[PDB]
Amino acid sequence: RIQETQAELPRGSIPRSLEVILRAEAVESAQAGDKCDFTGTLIVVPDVSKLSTPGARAETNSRVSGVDGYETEGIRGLRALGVRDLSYRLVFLACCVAPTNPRFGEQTAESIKNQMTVKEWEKVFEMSQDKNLYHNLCTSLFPTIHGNDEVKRGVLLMLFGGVPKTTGEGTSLRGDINVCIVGDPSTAKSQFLKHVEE
Amino acid sequence: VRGTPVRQRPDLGSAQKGLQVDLQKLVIWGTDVNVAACKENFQRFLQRFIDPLAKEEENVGIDITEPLYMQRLGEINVIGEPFLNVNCEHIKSFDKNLYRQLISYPQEVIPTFDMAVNEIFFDRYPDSILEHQIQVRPFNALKTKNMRNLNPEDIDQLITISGMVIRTSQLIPEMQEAFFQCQVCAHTTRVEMDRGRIAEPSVCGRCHTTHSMALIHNRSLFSDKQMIKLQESPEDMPAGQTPHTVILFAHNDLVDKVQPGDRVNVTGIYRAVPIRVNPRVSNVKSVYKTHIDVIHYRKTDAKRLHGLDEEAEQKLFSEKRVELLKELSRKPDIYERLASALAPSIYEHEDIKKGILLQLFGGTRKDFSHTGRGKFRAEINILLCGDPGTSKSQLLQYVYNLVPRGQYTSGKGSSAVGLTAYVMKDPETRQLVLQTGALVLSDNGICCIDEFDKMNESTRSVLHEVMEQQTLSIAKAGIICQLNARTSVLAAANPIESQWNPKKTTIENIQLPHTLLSRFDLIFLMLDPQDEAYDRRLAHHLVALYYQLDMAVLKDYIAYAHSTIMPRLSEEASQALIEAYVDMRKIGSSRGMVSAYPRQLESLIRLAEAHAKVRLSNKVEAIDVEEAKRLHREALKQSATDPRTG
Amino acid sequence: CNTDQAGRPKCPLDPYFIMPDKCKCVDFQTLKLQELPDAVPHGEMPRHM
Ligand SMILES: Nc1ncnc2c1ncn2[C@@H]1O[C@H](COP(=O)(O)OP(=O)(O)O)[C@@H](O)[C@H]1O
Numbered sequence A: 001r002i003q004e005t006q007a008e009l010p011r012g013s014i015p016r017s018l019e020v021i022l023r024a025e026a027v028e029s030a031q032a033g034d035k036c037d038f039t040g041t042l043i044v045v046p047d048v049s050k051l052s053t054p055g056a057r058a059e060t061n062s063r064v065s066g067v068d069g070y071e072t073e074g075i076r077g078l079r080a081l082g083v084r085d086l087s088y089r090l091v092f093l094a095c096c097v098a099p100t101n102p103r104f105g106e107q108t109a110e111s112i113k114n115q116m117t118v119k120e121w122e123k124v125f126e127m128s129q130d131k132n133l134y135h136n137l138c139t140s141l142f143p144t145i146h147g148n149d150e151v152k153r154g155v156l157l158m159l160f161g162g163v164p165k166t167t168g169e170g171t172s173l174r175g176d177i178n179v180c181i182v183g184d185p186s187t188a189k190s191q192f193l194k195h196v197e198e
Numbered sequence B: 001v002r003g004t005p006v007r008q009r010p011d012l013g014s015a016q017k018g019l020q021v022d023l024q025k026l027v028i029w030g031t032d033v034n035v036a037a038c039k040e041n042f043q044r045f046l047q048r049f050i051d052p053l054a055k056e057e058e059n060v061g062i063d064i065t066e067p068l069y070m071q072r073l074g075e076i077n078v079i080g081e082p083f084l085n086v087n088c089e090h091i092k093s094f095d096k097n098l099y100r101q102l103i104s105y106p107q108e109v110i111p112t113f114d115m116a117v118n119e120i121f122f123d124r125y126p127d128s129i130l131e132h133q134i135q136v137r138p139f140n141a142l143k144t145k146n147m148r149n150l151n152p153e154d155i156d157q158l159i160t161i162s163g164m165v166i167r168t169s170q171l172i173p174e175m176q177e178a179f180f181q182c183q184v185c186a187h188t189t190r191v192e193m194d195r196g197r198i199a200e201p202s203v204c205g206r207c208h209t210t211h212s213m214a215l216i217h218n219r220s221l222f223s224d225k226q227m228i229k230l231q232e233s234p235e236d237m238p239a240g241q242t243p244h245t246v247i248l249f250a251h252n253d254l255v256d257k258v259q260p261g262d263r264v265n266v267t268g269i270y271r272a273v274p275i276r277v278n279p280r281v282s283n284v285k286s287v288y289k290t291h292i293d294v295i296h297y298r299k300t301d302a303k304r305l306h307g308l309d310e311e312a313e314q315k316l317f318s319e320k321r322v323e324l325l326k327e328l329s330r331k332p333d334i335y336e337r338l339a340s341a342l343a344p345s346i347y348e349h350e351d352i353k354k355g356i357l358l359q360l361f362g363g364t365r366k367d368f369s370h371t372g373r374g375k376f377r378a379e380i381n382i383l384l385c386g387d388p389g390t391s392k393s394q395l396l397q398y399v400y401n402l403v404p405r406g407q408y409t410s411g412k413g414s415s416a417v418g419l420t421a422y423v424m425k426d427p428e429t430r431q432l433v434l435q436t437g438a439l440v441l442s443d444n445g446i447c448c449i450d451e452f453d454k455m456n457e458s459t460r461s462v463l464h465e466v467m468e469q470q471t472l473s474i475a476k477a478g479i480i481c482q483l484n485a486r487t488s489v490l491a492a493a494n495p496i497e498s499q500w501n502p503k504k505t506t507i508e509n510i511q512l513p514h515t516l517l518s519r520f521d522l523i524f525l526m527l528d529p530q531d532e533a534y535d536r537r538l539a540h541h542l543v544a545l546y547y548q549l550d551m552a553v554l555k556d557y558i559a560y561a562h563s564t565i566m567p568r569l570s571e572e573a574s575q576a577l578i579e580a581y582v583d584m585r586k587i588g589s590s591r592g593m594v595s596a597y598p599r600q601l602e603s604l605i606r607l608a609e610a611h612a613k614v615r616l617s618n619k620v621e622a623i624d625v626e627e628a629k630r631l632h633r634e635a636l637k638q639s640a641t642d643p644r645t646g
Numbered sequence C: 001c002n003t004d005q006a007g008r009p010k011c012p013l014d015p016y017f018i019m020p021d022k023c024k025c026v027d028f029q030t031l032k033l034q035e036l037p038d039a040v041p042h043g044e045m046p047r048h049m
């Protein structure tokens, strides 16, 4: 089940949600939260509709009339004529799947290196080697917020995270960084959060 | 006809018998319409009808001398859209009997009008190509002031009502031409819909195998459809009658044309249909239900402002009107003129009216996506903090009745879920659906919150997200999303004890958290000065109401401003704004006053941009920023309050 | 019995008895026609109907 992206909502509307169907190789190619890009064909699917208003019956074209005691009236006649309601839903049949915004042009560092192209890999390498990368990342990630350099640095470290670990007895050592911002109103806290999300 | 395919008209329902009956001329059975006479009358109406009272502003691109709808047909030739909106009022004026026949027999008459328009159009143009034959939309039928007064005698007739859209269901596909294929020889046949049903071939036409033909759902042909839950605005409101919700149905071109919260005059056929006892049995109920097969949507209203769609449309103003509005802008006191025009019968609230006008005009929409900053609120928010009986409720109601996409809530009558969204069981599909709230229905308009202090924080918390990021992030059990709520909030608050103590400071009297008050980019203290002249003139005005600029120009000015005015900060205005914010913060550092945070610099930018838009400058200027300063300062009575006490 | 809607409890299978006194009857007769003796070929049997 997918729903329309926020970039396409009309005014005052609720996003339209439709079910798309993946077949064969693509069966598990979409995961929750992903901004996928389904390519395929729209289709209709017969529906067992609960509409109490009759509509669009389909029946035989052979003119047959029940004899006395077996008249084509009621459920008997409906069944004999083969009357069925033509109620449909719109469903999407996706042959291929792919993210809307590709990140690159199990998981491991070598896997990421291979997945990313030569230009992207060289850019990553050169920025990794670049000096003052800490300040560069902070500034490039928060180009509108002034001050709060400590908050910027903390959020960057949170984004990079730690190294989760598990002890011999089983107890786990959390490696994720938790950050909280407390302060006076209009101090850019929501701005930091929205930067992080976007 | 020129070989064009005559598309079906699902709005007109399933075609009927169409039995011709001779009265001895050759009427349709059960009616008094003869196709030849109706077609000739409508052809005459098209060929030669001129509006004597028509105004150049009422009709744009239309000469009041040449016949009206021939120019419309010329437009339909120029563009591809094969639709012709015909005014039932014009039909009534031209041929009254034709109007009565149209209103009483829409399904029969309207196809004759379609035939006539197609004949005339394809006679005039032997080469113009259209996807389908032109279709006639009769609107402006004599308004039905209340659906509750319509009677079974009116069923299947063309009525017109008015109301705001509460909900618009998903696109429902409808069968029009079934496709059948043989399970033996693969012989293909098509069966068009006939009187609301389809006849299965039951025998192959090639191999003669009985019942070898199977229906191919996705090779058949379908047409769009959409349920629309609309709330009626009955002009005639009898005592003890609650508001009314009426089911509409759009068909194949009106699907997804009116969003929830939009106010529209809907002209359409008033249908009555049976109710099945169960969704699985065919037994129906003796009592039918009624709905509206919509023929035409009309957005334009006389007592409201131009809607978003009308503003977007290019040909909304004649060149003469554009020049007139530009002259009115070059006029030096346009700001005060428009402020006075707003709420003409509210006595000398000049500053509040100016603020409300700036709210209506709104700032500039900004695309900060590339900056990773978020979405900036261009809307302006106003809070009228005043003693009960200071006309704040009157101003709220005036704005509510003036603005399109306006919602109104008061005090403890609202809830967080009811304002944001919720889940109900649509009692026509028996399916669980999601219904919006006031803050969403007013997405691109205004929400008026009266009694803004009796708003127990459980629901007042919702306003933070709406007023900060124009978004309403709902994460409920099943549905997760963020709804656009780009509203403008006009709120009314009463000081604690329902009376303004002249000893407690501004904040101590307002009693609203600074976190919230900093969101409102305008706060007006409606306080009563015990003044002889004010009391005397107010009494004169109030008594004058007991015995005795144009809305048109105001509406057109606002529409043009929104259409093509996008003020941009100039360098001088930028420096002025910087100095304004520093001075305002310095002043607001006082103990009890309303302190100023960078949200107030944002507010000053918003107000300056709104004033520039009012001036049609397209460039925000030091004049605009100074006016924003003055307005924000006179509001809250900063000049009249010392930096220590109130 | 198709008229089961008048009451929920149902009538049996094969419930109908013909009412004699409500029958519109007519006279009917059976005759045995034999080929014409002058039509029967020489060595043959007379056909019947
Ligand atoms: N230190 C700052 N630097 C830049 N902008 C700021 C700063 N503080 C506040 N702002 C501005 O004020 C606006 C409102 O801040 P907001 O996100 O509401 O903070 P909070 O959520 O903590 O009240 C933001 O859109 C932001 O641009």
Ligand SMILES: [Mg+2]
Binding pocket: A189, A190
């Ligand atoms: Mg915040």
Ligand SMILES: [Zn+2]
Binding pocket: B182, B183, B184, B185, B186, B187, B204, B205, B206, B207, B208, B209, B212
């Ligand atoms: Zn066949």
